[PDB]
Amino acid sequence: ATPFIFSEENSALEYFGEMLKAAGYNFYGTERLYSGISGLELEADIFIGVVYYQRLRHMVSDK
């Protein structure tokens, strides 16, 4: 994920899209989600993936 290695003729979405097409999943990262408060299928497909979150020290005030 180094900057400036993806051009405009070899994009960053025509690369990982083809990586996901090779892994069976959707080209655009959108997986079909059901619900849990109802039980049936959401009709607009939902973008899911793995994102490295962090955690700030700027905590809740406890005051």
Partner: protein, 51 residues
């Protein structure tokens, strides 16, 4: 031992070391382009749908 004066000098030759020839090559030598990323060989669906 009188050391009399003389006339005005016409020109002043300046001796100096020559320019550094054959230091730079006639083609240029650039850092090669970092390659575009490849789709790796041997990619297959490892996830089967359950049931």
């Amino acid at each position: 031992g009188g050391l009399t004066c003389a006339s005005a000098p016409q020109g002043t030759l300046r001796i100096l070391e020559g320019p550094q020839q054959s230091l730079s090559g006639s083609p240029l030598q650039p850092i090669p382009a970092s390659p575009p990323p490849q789709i790796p060989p041997g990619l297959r669906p490892r996830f089967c749908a359950f049931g």
